[PDB]
Design a protein that fits this description.
Number of strands of chain A: 18
Structural class of chain A: alpha+beta
Helix content of chain A: 25-40%
GO molecular function (chain B): ATPase binding; cadmium ion binding; calcium-dependent protein binding; calmodulin binding; enzyme binding; flavin adenine dinucleotide binding; FMN binding; heme binding
Keywords (chain B): Calmodulin-binding, Cell membrane, Cell projection, FAD, Flavoprotein, FMN, Heme, Iron, Membrane, Metal-binding, NADP, Oxidoreductase, Phosphoprotein, Synapse, Ubl conjugation
CATH topology of the largest domain in chain A: Nitric Oxide Synthase, Chain A, domain 1
Family (chain B): Belongs to the NOS family.
CATH superfamily of the largest domain in chain A: Nitric Oxide Synthase, Chain A, domain 1
CATH architecture of the largest domain in chain A: Alpha-Beta Complex
Radius of gyration of chain A: 23 Å
Oligomer: homodimer
Number of helices of chain A: 10
Strand content of chain A: 5-15%
Bound molecules: protoporphyrin IX containing FE, the ligand Cc1cc(N)nc(C[C@H]2CNC[C@H]2OCCNCC(F)(F)c2cccc(F)c2)c1, 5,6,7,8-tetrahydrobiopterin, zinc ion
Number of domains of chain A: 3
Order of helices and strands of chain A: EEHHHEHEEEEHEEEEEEEEEHHHEHHE
CATH class of the largest domain in chain A: Alpha Beta
GO biological process, one term (chain B): response to lipopolysaccharide
Shape of chain A: globular
Largest interface: A-B, 64 and 64 residues
Protein name (chain B): Nitric oxide synthase 1
Chain lengths: ~400, ~400
């Protein structure tokens, strides 16, 4: 019932009790671990509402106060009559911060309590959504001094009136299948790009075309909007030693902003809740640039470095990998766009785990995602045992909307 | 029931049925995943079903399930258990059992090799001197002058838990560690405690940075005894770098033969508490973990200094840069001395092919992603993108507590 996690580099042992408050299922059993699998009514709503309000009122040190019992009877009355309920601003803010706090796959959670919440629950149309989104982008970007933000659109009602951002991130590049048989741009985005073109988009057909937003309000058909280019901060990628690096034609955007998840607070479901922070360098330099099914640039870079590509054991892939990632961090730092390296992020996350163990009795964490995709064991998180469990409020995955939308 | 795993790079989807034969528990539940936790005297009653399950598997593997030979073997084992409380494996069953413990080792990336394993039967061994001799022979056979061959030596099984054979070393070959009065460590800090035990037992320590430890060997539950492996049997590689001539002057070397000696082999309910096995190294084990862990030789600073890297900011990636050069050096050195080694690209690619074959021929392949993914350059190896299912099959290799913690000293 009390569980220990050990750090094998430092011998520090922490005790987890927070897991007992865990509610949802991991996908594992006593017979099988699914730790590396990517995706493992009024009667339902009231326990959910109650559990959330109990944790909310405890956090403000007013558990079992009149204010507490009053809010419970009020929501109870509201659910019993209207089948849903509305969160107070204070509850919404608390719920959003905590869904981030509980995000077991997020290495950047030391920042959890510094999150600007934009309440967009009064939004009714796709143009409205676009206005809210541009304002989030500009606020978060802050001319390169990035600030964490979330914008929260109206909650699910009967499920036929969902608000959704169709994009997976607010800012991503287009992907095009070619007569050649190769892919131009980002291969991850081929299908979404096609959906955009078929809905009317004027694709430039370049390597790095910022995708239009495709916004769905009130369960209506989604609409296209082009984010003002002056609000999309981009970084030209150069290397501090290799003058040729710039000729590769590489750039990335400054603002990572996940826009396809579901925020669940007190049993209420917010199907459109784009959120953003700032990058850890490896996301761009390891995953975006070097994944084989992504920009897949290792071959090109190694060739420019004139490495021996004849045998895997020369570690040419590894060598070029480091260089690419050096370039990403240098370019961002030189243009004064907030970025964190994997060393510094993982060190902060260990500090955050310790604070969470001390102040909350634990920190749910998914080792498979926390450990960076390069140089695993030379970061402290590699040697840190982590317990993975699901707490609410939460961010959840949801089916891509085109699979489900009735046109 | 069917479980699917996907590769997110290739979109190859596989179906696991083998997890249905899985017995033991993972440590995980529906409410918690303990996938990153390092560590999450039987009865006749419990023994015959374990024997039976094993023998059914063995006899199916040879296409003789339900044969007279199969039935007679079940009867003979059943009778042996009721009469003596235990039983003895036939040579053939031992070999099969040891091969399958390796096949089932979900944390091992090298399992493509599982069916090529030399099994040395040391169940007639009675003394620590006998153990030493068996172990010298395994080391010489496995080393094979650099052309490494996988082997396991199997000492007598547990009886009452009071007469255990144990090898006290965690690996047959490892370097001593020495805690200094000023708090620094000379040699391998991982082996400080074991080194102290060796010294107490009477080892004369050379007190250098790479002193091969003696074997400390326990036969039949007796107090363990010290033996020096003949140095001519211990193949070592001095580490140099193909382009950087100053690399040799760090004075690094490592041994060629990785040989785990502290695990317990379970076959059909029998427990082999001393079963040293060896294969060959994947480069990163040395270049990343042994050399670069903060709690090990910790050479990153000194290497990056000599490379004149910008060390004032982590964001220069000086650590990542020196790390790659160190690992190039290890691979170069072994290859130049014709000592078998595999790089992490080649090893992981081979593992994926092994895994897919296993799904097709066996209905699954239990695999622990946390351990399978190499400790550098994770996502440019194909295993990073491979979903895996971790579950426990027998025969198996298991951890056991260090023996100095449990041993009853006789004097
Ligand atoms: C402030 C800087 C932040 C950093 C450096 C950071 C870091 C990261 C990284 C590296 C990942 C893994 C992503 C991947 O590999 O695809 C991640 C995942 C995630 N983060 Fe953060 N994060 C930050 C801010 C935020 C914010 C503001 C939120 C929400 C309010 C958030 C919630 C999440 C969630 C839910 C995931 C899992 C996403 C998924 O499952 O695909 N993070 N974080
Ligand atoms: C033939 C070449 C082999 C290679 C390249 C190889 C590779 C590896 C590696 C890299 C690990 C993880 C080591 C660590 O991080 O401590 C490992 C673990 C393991 N391997 Fe192998 N292996 C080989 C042969 C063998 C053999 C012959 C056996 C037994 C017959 C074996 C059984 C195991 C077991 C039981 C583990 C988990 C050890 C633990 O939990 O500490 N492997 N293997
Ligand atoms: C807010 C924030 C800050 C930050 N630094 N980084 C982020 C993650 C973003 C950026 N860089 C990757 C992207 O993360 C979004 C991608 N998440 C995983 C997936 F959606 F691709 C996915 C696909 C299929 C199955 C599955 F389980 C998950 C968010
Ligand atoms: C046979 C074989 C071949 C090969 N290439 N490699 C090997 C593993 C060896 C070599 N290189 C590392 C070492 O493995 C032994 C170190 N593993 C970790 C541990 F087992 F010691 C351990 C520590 C703490 C808790 C726990 F549960 C386990 C064996
Ligand atoms: C199969 C495996 O679960 C999958 O490749 C995961 C591994 N770890 C990850 N870690 C992060 N941070 N992001 C990812 O997309 C993944 N992919
Ligand atoms: C806490 C964590 O599980 C621990 O550091 C593991 C991670 N992965 C590993 N993987 C391998 N191959 N060897 C190890 O020792 C470890 N250590
Ligand atoms: Zn699990």
């Amino acid at each position: 019932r009390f569980l220990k996690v050990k750090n094998w580099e430092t011998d520090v042992v922490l005790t987890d009790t927070l897991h007992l408050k865990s509610t949802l299922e991991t996908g594992c059993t006593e017979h099988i671990c699914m730790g590396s699998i990517m995706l493992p009514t009024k009667d339902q709503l009231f326990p959910l509402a109650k559990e959330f309000l109990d944790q909310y009122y405890s956090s403000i040190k007013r558990f079992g106060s009149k204010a507490h019992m009053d809010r419970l009877e009020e929501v109870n009355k509201e659910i019993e009559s209207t089948s849903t309920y509305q969160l107070k601003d204070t509850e919404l803010i608390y719920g959003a911060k905590h869904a981030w706090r509980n995000a077991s796959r997020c290495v950047g959670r030391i920042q959890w309590s510094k999150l600007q919440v934009f309440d967009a629950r009064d939004c009714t149309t796709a143009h409205g959504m676009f206005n809210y989104i541009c304002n989030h982008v500009k606020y978060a970007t802050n001319k390169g001094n990035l600030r964490s933000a979330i914008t929260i659109f109206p909650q699910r009602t009967d499920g036929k009136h969902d608000f959704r951002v169709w994009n997976s991130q607010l800012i991503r590049y287009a992907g095009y299948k070619q007569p050649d048989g190769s892919t131009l741009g980002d291969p991850a985005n081929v299908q979404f790009t096609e959906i955009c073109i078929q809905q009317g988009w004027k694709a430039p057909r370049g390597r790095f075309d910022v995708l239009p937003l495709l916004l769905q309000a009130n369960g209506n058909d989604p609409e296209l909007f082009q984010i003002p280019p002056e609000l999309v901060l981009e970084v030209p990628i150069r290397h501090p030693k290799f003058d040729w690096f710039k000729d590769l034609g590489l750039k990335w955007y400054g603002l990572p902003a996940v826009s396809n998840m579901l925020l669940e607070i007190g049993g209420l479901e917010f199907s459109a809740c784009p959120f953003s922070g700032w990058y850890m360098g490896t996301e761009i330099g390891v995953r975006d640039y070097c994944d084989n099914s992504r920009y897949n640039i290792l071959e090109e870079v190694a060739k420019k470095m004139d490495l021996d590509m004849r045998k895997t054991s020369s570690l040419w892939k590894d060598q070029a990998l480091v260089e690419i990632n050096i370039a990403v961090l240098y370019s961002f730092q030189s243009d004064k766009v907030t970025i964190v390296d994997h060393h510094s992020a993982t060190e902060s996350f260990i500090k955050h785990m310790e604070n969470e163990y001390r102040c909350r009795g634990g920190c749910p964490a998914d080792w498979v995602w926390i450990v960076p995709p390069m140089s695993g064991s030379i970061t402290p998180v590699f040697h840190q045992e982590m317990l993975n469990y699901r707490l609410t409020p939460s961010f959840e995955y949801q089916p891509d909307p085109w699979n489900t939308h009735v046109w």
